[PDB]
Design a protein around this ligand. Sequence first.
Ligand SMILES: [Cl-]
Ligand SMILES: [Cl-]
Ligand SMILES: [Cl-]
Ligand SMILES: [Cl-]
Ligand SMILES: [Cl-]
Ligand SMILES: [Cl-]
Ligand SMILES: [Cl-]
Ligand SMILES: [Cl-]
Ligand SMILES: [Cl-]
Ligand SMILES: [Cl-]
Ligand code: NA
Ligand code: NA
Ligand code: NA
Ligand code: NA
Lengths: 254, 254, 254, 254
Amino acid sequence: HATAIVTNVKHFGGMGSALRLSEAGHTVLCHDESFKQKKELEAFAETYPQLKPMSEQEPAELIRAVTRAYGQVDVLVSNDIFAPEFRPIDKYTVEDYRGAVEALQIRPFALVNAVASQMKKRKSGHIIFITSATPFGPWKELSTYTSARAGANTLANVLSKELGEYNIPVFAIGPNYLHSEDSPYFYPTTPWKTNPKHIAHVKKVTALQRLGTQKELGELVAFLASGSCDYLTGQIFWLAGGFPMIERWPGMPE
Amino acid sequence: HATAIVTNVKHFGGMGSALRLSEAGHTVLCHDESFKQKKELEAFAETYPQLKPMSEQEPAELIRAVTRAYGQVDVLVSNDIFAPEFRPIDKYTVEDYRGAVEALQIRPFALVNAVASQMKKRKSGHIIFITSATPFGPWKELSTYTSARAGANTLANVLSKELGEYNIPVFAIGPNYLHSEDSPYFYPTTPWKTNPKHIAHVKKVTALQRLGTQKELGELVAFLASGSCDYLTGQIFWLAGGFPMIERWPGMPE
Amino acid sequence: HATAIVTNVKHFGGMGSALRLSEAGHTVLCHDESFKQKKELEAFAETYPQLKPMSEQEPAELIRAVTRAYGQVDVLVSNDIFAPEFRPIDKYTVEDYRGAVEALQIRPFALVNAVASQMKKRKSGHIIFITSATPFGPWKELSTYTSARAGANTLANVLSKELGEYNIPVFAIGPNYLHSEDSPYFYPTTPWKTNPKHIAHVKKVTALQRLGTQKELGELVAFLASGSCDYLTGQIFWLAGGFPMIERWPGMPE
Amino acid sequence: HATAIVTNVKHFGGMGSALRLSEAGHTVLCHDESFKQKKELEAFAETYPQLKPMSEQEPAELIRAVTRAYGQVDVLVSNDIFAPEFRPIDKYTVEDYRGAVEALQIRPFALVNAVASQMKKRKSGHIIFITSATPFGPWKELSTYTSARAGANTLANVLSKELGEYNIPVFAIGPNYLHSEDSPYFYPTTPWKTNPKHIAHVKKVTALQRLGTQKELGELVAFLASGSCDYLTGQIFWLAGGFPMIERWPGMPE
Ligand SMILES: [Cl-]
Ligand SMILES: [Cl-]
Ligand SMILES: [Cl-]
Ligand SMILES: [Cl-]
Ligand SMILES: [Cl-]
Ligand SMILES: [Cl-]
Ligand SMILES: [Cl-]
Ligand SMILES: [Cl-]
Ligand SMILES: [Cl-]
Ligand SMILES: [Cl-]
Ligand code: NA
Ligand code: NA
Ligand code: NA
Ligand code: NA
């Protein structure tokens, strides 16, 4: 069976991806910061017997471990996370930007850098970055997070050009307003399904007037990873329910 | 079962769409200019017993006929076609542009204009335009066709904003280098799989170094129409295998 | 001296363009629908002695008349207008879309189709379309106007590819929230500087928290027409003060 | 008088920017890595008496020194450079990507982080990044450089949203094929005007069939810095002569 790595599986698009990839018949190797602790890894493995958590934390280490134990990495889902911190540009430190770039650009780069050679040698593989739709509709005072996510989107697009010759599609999925259940990355049930202000905000700024679901994200990840539509390689997908809705002139209804 | 209209079914993305939608369990009502002739309609119906060709040619007429005979239109695939004519801007006539706009913008607009009310009333439906990736990577001297296709892409994106409130996703799929078998719209087997110059051109300008397949287009259409990933509403998909490849500096290999 | 045509001079970007081009030393030939009436044309010529209003209305006749009287057309500013009419997609007629594409796509196409040969023969000229920033940040229920403007933007970008061989730059300037003085196209003094609701809306949705000025538009038109920065050819300029501002999460200041 | 900082003045868009800003009446404070050597700084000051070279290298020290000596920083031109190194993704090291993001994203971020407070306090200033058009038309095997430049472009666009409230426009100018005279960043006279292969390549891939000039870049920088067209804030300018030209089908002329 085909192998798939999902990183930061407890957060963002991790569970939607891992669960739907597993249902599609992949062996899903799952990374997470919490899996440094045996108790957390074992608890996850018991709750999700169809998933295979690994303890390895860093990119080369993780790729090498999965390759040793399962033969090869057929699918990489780089589910990258970093807390958005809103500040006026002069109130950040430079290290605040470096941290965002490290988590949101250097990390997916390092994973591809470690796995690309084995994919190129057999001329097969799929690479998916989960990034952000914030560059499409940016908020004021989120300059660090948003620009790093744009770097990752362009990284995916550029990589598609060189890896296409080796039959390796590369995609970026950029969500916004994706319900993240009990993860703070980025729309947890509380407040986003519980507080009237937040419920009204989502109804206002998305065309579909709701949060996106983990199932929708997982369906897209599994579809791309299936090899059924490789000709989309290089695509940045905006998975944001039609966000942004743009405020209309006075006198028009919402 | 859910109904799906595919227009110009003999051409462009028509057969990939109709066949994969049918496999997914839709009743697929098929439009085509050739179905004005009973012999052509009956021959198609015999060759493809899982498809239902209609004789109706024009938008309101077609929507009304399918609604009368099958109850409702759940999915619209506006597979729009017009021959690309390359000319210096001053060598066209103004009517050359009007013809492109009529075929590539007014036609999908007219179809949505005719079907939107029934979708809005029941708060369900999916709309897919098959357009072109030419606006993403334009060729010189194709100003009429390319700009009309961009109008259609923007039409899809804008429509997603108003129809989202009614739970109707709207998408545009913009192909290039899609193999179109025995249709001249736009990459027929001859010359594109038979002539060495054409084979070499496709290898040069696409990242995956091949034509796209009807199966890949059909997989995307059926995935979007399935209701499995509505949160992509408003997306323009570039289905062009990583086109364009951009020419590199002297001294670098191809 | 160098000649420039500015169309619909009384509206949208017309006076900013005409007045700044004249100050930069162009002979500015002005079109306007009101110039069908001799009295209107003569009142304009008396108020603006540095401008030269023409009575011609149709693109071919206008280009021919300017060429006959002033030798050549060095700069074309296609300042296109159409009344934005907001409707749900099913409440338009198809003719409502044809009217929008005729005014916003066919017309700039016809003007370039009529003037390009003379510019190509001498290998000099500049072409500027004034379009819209609505495709960048679309409002719901403006599907006709917005998609036609996107067609015009792509037309300019595609035209740049063929005309660059002849040393003719082509640009599109897409405004939003440009103050238009007494013209209803699209942000007249009343209500946009006089009604508190409109004043508040402009402050909220633009980054600079004000309307754009005719002077700003004219400075950009004159700069591009000057031959000082031809290497921008093909650019779509968003002249919208940093619109759109995107609504932020609850808890964050405006 | 108004002050402007131009970084890496000997390279890329540095001299075009500095020389045209000076001609427009700015006091132009010039940074360059070579100005670590007193002899280099003094030779520059003697050749260009209208320019003021500074020895400071680090962003905070440079802004502080200009502010101390000349009162304030009115215009920042962050003319960022890094050597483009083409490699397959697996042949880079991770540090190769960190170097690119440090030079092309962290550095402009640090300069704005150091200068923004003084501009905000007085509600005036202009910020221009010189980036790259490579994200618009990416070459294969340049994943580090190209994705870092896209990060910088998005940084400028996001910054425009918060700084517009303070009347500070932010722009990114993304060049390609800009003639850079004796600088190797990125199109020096030799080989790009002297080697037939390079001459042919520029003719093929740009619409205007030539390199861009330092004067064209400087005209755009001075125009944006002038305060004449602030309503363009947030714009990414592609200063690439209509690049990329996209290869056409067999049978069509070049
Ligand atoms: Cl490691
Ligand atoms: Cl999200
Ligand atoms: Cl009809
Ligand atoms: Cl195609
Ligand atoms: Cl006339
Ligand atoms: Cl406007
Ligand atoms: Cl004004
Ligand atoms: Cl220093
Ligand atoms: Cl350059
Ligand atoms: Cl030069
Ligand atoms: Na372990
Ligand atoms: Na019939
Ligand atoms: Na007359
Ligand atoms: Na010093």
